[PDB]
């Protein structure tokens, strides 16, 4: 993976409602990051455009894979660049009334390596004095994307609004990042108070380089944005920005230096968990089994899981819908469990219990744990009894046949 | 309780070794504070002293209560006025090779209405290289402290280093803090790059004001503060800064500032709960009993309560040390609660699991859920039934000599 | 002389074309800082109006000073605080549509302490995309203030614009002040940018506290300020702020804090004084005194003088109008001088000239130095001699010359 | 002239008594510019070394001299591109306890292209508690050395303790600089507090890019430097910064920018040159040429030339010595000068008169000015007598003036 020194340009733009006139400020500058052999150039929230009217900024997004897009995608190619697309008006083709804000990640190919939507808007409804609402222009992102592999290292992703958030940015730290992202699109009169304190603060809070490509300037009569699209080192100093107006900065940013500080300072490693627990609802993919004890529990048989746990189909069901949620440390008791993980298991067992319900088409469960020889605990790796009831109350082939159900309902 | 504007005086100071001079220095801003009517005063952490060697800063740790304490006490009798003793070195009569690092805020009569031990403490050991051990000075605190109401508003106890860690602060807020607070002694080459920006960011995060008095100049040969002692509004504008020397500042905080920014900014309105969530291990007290349903569990029934559940005796124990865990919110089901609920009503769980097995002294017990009519639910009203297990497996006032004994160990 | 710690109150507002709205934000912060015991506030720039056109603020400036003029000199009184009055728009009784920009300083009586006029004013005339003329709704000043003694120090006098240019502030400090004060209206965008940095810069670099209350927020539809009122140290640190509303802040300042760091950074004892010199036009008030060589020169002959020079009436003149234009330090060789008192000897020199070829009506003049007993001098001290010329042209009583005194110290 | 964009590289660094580990610190700083195509890079001030005592820094000095200056060179011409040595330790031949602080520009040739000496030394003489002397490790240049063209545009030149300093920067900005360089090594304590508003301040009431490479970390056990080298644009934007270590930032300035910025804020063009002036000691260099009235006046003949002044022999001359001083712009009156010219002007004459007695060896002077025709003005130009004077006392071949002109000239 990406170590070492690497250069980076940022872009800054006051984007129109005006696509093409758009996209040449923004072509102008990735060929100049291009010519400077920039490894990657970032790009604004809105980097699309910002129309005048809301049935312009809905009836102009994207599709991500459309004409516009190829755009990016072939000067990615052209110019062997890697590309942080900061905010897409991104189509949904079922919901057209909610675009998405995605911040797109593109090879050197043209290949988009990550999506992120953003998930944090501002919604302000104060009954007769002003409503301002976010989520009528666009929708809300529904996952947590965890941090990207590039070429200049672990890049987190997120957008505007999210800096203001220090749980998700805390979050994608842990998930190793080493540069987080903020392309955003602030407010003249909030981005004069709260930007750079913001994002110099999560750089030092996290160790990370901080990236934001802005917009700035006037949009139309009725919209001005902050500009000052800066990087921020691990140590909070503004090491490069953009002047005032539609034009790029340059950045070497210096993973070992990332190293160096998350050594002297290990400030993650001081964190209090016994008092207190960021827990996230992660939804990740195994493309291989689990230890369940000792035992090997199949990927084919596992329906869902997260770093912390997993649920798995049951040898011997107790009953039809019995399946079992234990947490990928191999540990007999529940008392061994640190709250990261106590609170995921039983998380992931209400996850996991309604989608039993709405399928085994039932309205009760019952959730038991053997800790203990005494209480019937028949192997060392603790483990939920998640069984749905009713009235009344193993295939190694049908085991698997299971689990796909549910996994596709998980 | 505290609303509108207050007036208060941040001190700023460098202590010696020399805990009359350090005094002197003190209680001539305090004279001067109450000149002014101010109604707090804020004075930084090792306001009391910093030795020169640790022999020292381990040998005149106080108590909290003793002569020199009683000379801050008396003072604040003496000019009306509420005290922020930032830091002080708190001697523990059982080990004395740790004190605490004590946060105290003291009455207009001198009466200490809260007490925080710092929670985050500084190690750094890296093999052959360099090794500071803060942890080796002094110890950290056990407990969550919730913010302390006061004429000036809801504040929010922290210490230096504590600043570094926004879960803490984030907490604060949801506990309904106005004002944050960070005494410190921060190093000169670490406060010059972090200082002013995560102060700034922590009030502008939790839309609190946040006061912070600081240590500044050299303490000794091998020790330098950063100084800069200030106020920050809710909206990250530094209000109030002491000049670089032994000194104070002042200030007008406006309670009504932090209503209108929280009601035109509901940043805390706009966090994805659904995706993450901060836990935090609160132990609160219950004058009172609570809904169990539609039923009323007696205080003296309920051994242990947080801010989200509490554990009571069972009227019916299906054997020694059968209780039941619920969600002070009454909800029916598991899938009815939220994250926070649910991953408080496990890690409650996983508390009280523990401590009935090291009273029954036993290694074994049984975690059950009855969600659902059909899996037995009697009540309306979710509830973990924590039943410890052996081989073999209600009098009113002897329910509640259950709750005595267990309370203590909890 | 002032001296110790004092305690200030500084005001930021949204002032707009409602005289009594303005007036009621103003009095109600005059109140709350004369509750604190403060010992002086500070209002804004544009403190009493902001109108929607011209027409409207030459109204505005009239109904300015015929209500609340006075109701300020009254709280000034009530409140026994001192006022700074950052910049009104003082009404010229020959010109309504060209007012000054007056910073005025109110004393506990309510009694004009100084005035200031704005000397640096914003005019922008590209023909193509723009006209944005400050000169036209207003008039720049004419003469350089000094600062003004106050209960809280030596304060330096300035309107917002003038920040741009360290000259004023480096003067003022030469003249003296311990604090330089900056009330203002910035540009959202300009302020945004240079606001506290430059507040800051003159606080370094003068080593003076730096007091500046502004205008915040939307006054009109097409008016905006960038706000962020403060108060700056010596060392340049921002002891005090507004919070982003119409609002005040305190600062408790500390003569003791200048007067230390004029000690251990003695920035102005550092100075090329040989390489640059900064020379400023100052018109000195004098008791009177000034020798010229061992000789002592009444003030009823000096008409002129500036903290480097003085000029006076000639006792034996060798013609009409012959005067003598000298400098304070007595020395007798012009290379004796140092480049800030050649330049000021020679630009007094200047106005003499133009003042006595206006009043004695010629057209020419002779200035002549005679350094040196080979040159004819007969005092030792610099005196540089003005001579009005006619086409004719080639021991008076005390009476002639005072009179002659008077007549060209009135032309001056 | 430069125009457009390019692309600078700055350079912090700890530099020690090591000569070869700062070198190589430099040098691959050098290196990864040079890659990335910058086409000038900025050294800190003493990048060379920083001793740990006088006579180490004497050593040093000419250990530097000797092996490094070339091998600097010869990285400006392998990696094609410009250097800007902050400020290194300039032994002087007949003083090695007082080098000079040189900031030198050396070209893609490796060829001085310009040499700053820097004016401002910090000195602190408290009889009671403190002594710290730069002028006893140094001393302090003797020129006003006006900007240096470069690829990077008009290049105007200074050395840290220069910043606190306004009148040095105006200066260059009249000049005609595009950007102002202050490489240094503030100290840890001051350079926390003043660093970054100083180095803005500058670019803004300059509207000039400000490039300030410099010493970061601990040099020696009892030395430290506060780092935080950048870049500030003419808005006063910090748009590149190093990290806090050895190492560099990179920064693409646009001078289209400050001409921009230039016109919508004509700050220089709003100075109250009536009120204040800054004057500026400044020899200038001419191909020769100057009017005198409708006179042509050869080089031969002008021994002395400044931006506002111009001095020349005489054909005719009442005595030995006899020379004038002239304005460049050709006005009649003495009353048609400003200020500026007044001040300069005079203060030529001043170091004329001087010069002029020191060679003649004469003690006393005459200087005479006739403005207008009954003052016996021949010519319509202002023009300074300046006559040496003897006990004694009161049309020449070109060869004779010309001589003079020569003589004269190699004495100012
Ligand atoms: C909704 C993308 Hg700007
Ligand atoms: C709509 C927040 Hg960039
Ligand atoms: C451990 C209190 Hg400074
Ligand atoms: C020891 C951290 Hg203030
Ligand atoms: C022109 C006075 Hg605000
Ligand atoms: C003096 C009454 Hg307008
Ligand atoms: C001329 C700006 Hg208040
Ligand atoms: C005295 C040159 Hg660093
Ligand atoms: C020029 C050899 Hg030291
Ligand atoms: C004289 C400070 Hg580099
Ligand atoms: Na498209
Ligand atoms: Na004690
Ligand atoms: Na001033
Ligand atoms: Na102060
Ligand atoms: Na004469
Ligand atoms: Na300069
Ligand atoms: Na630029
Ligand atoms: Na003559």
Not at 171 to 190: E, H, I, V
Request: net charge negative; proline share 5%; glycine share 6%.
């Amino acid at each position: 993976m990406a170590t070492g020194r690497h250069f980076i340009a940022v872009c800054q733009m006051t984007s129109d409602n005006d696509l093409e006139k758009n996209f040449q400020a923004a072509k102008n500058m990735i060929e100049r990051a291009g010519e400077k052999k920039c490894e990657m150039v970032f790009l604004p929230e809105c980097f699309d455009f910002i129309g005048l009217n809301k049935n312009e900024q809905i009836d102009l997004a994207m599709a991500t894979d459309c004409e516009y897009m190829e755009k990016y995608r072939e000067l990615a190619r052209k110019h062997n660049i890697w590309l942080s697309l900061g905010g897409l008006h991104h189509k949904d083709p079922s919901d057209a009334a909610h675009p998405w804000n995605t911040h797109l990640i593109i090879d050197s190919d043209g290949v988009t390596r990550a999506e992120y939507n953003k998930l944090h808007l501002f919604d302000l409804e104060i009954p007769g004095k002003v409503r301002l609402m976010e989520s009528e222009f666009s929708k809300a992102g529904t996952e947590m994307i965890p941090p990207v592999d590039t070429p200049i290292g672990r890049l987190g992703l997120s957008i505007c609004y999210d800096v203001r958030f220090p749980e998700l940015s805390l979050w994608n730290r842990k998930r190793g990042a080493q540069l987080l992202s903020f392309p955003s699109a602030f407010t003249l009169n909030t981005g004069l108070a709260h930007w750079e304190t913001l994002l110099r603060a999560r750089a030092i809070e996290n160790q990370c380089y901080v990236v934001a490509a802005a917009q700035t300037g006037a949009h139309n009569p009725k919209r001005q944005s902050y500009g000052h699209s800066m990087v921020v080192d691990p140590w909070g100093a503004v090491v490069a920005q953009c002047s005032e107006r539609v034009d790029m900065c340059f950045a070497e940013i210096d993973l070992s230096y990332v190293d160096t500080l998350r050594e002297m300072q290990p400030v993650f490693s001081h964190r209090r968990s016994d008092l207190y627990t960021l827990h996230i609802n992660e939804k990740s993919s195994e493309t291989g089994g689990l230890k369940f004890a000792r035992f090997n529990i199949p990927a084919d048989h596992i329906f869902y899981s997260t770093p912390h746990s997993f649920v798995f189909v049951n040898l011997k069901p107790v009953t039809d819908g019995h399946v079992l949620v234990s947490p990928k440390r191999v540990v007999p008791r529940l008392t061994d469990l640190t709250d990261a993980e106590t609170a995921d298991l039983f998380i992931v067992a209400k996850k996991v219990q309604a989608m039993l319900e709405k399928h085994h088409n039932v309205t009760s469960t019952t959730i038991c744990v053997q800790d203990g020889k005494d209480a019937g605990q028949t192997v060392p790796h603790v483990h939920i009894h998640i069984l749905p009831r009713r009235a009344g109350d193993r295939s190694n082939e049908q085991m698997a046949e299971e689990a796909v159900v549910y996994r596709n309902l998980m």
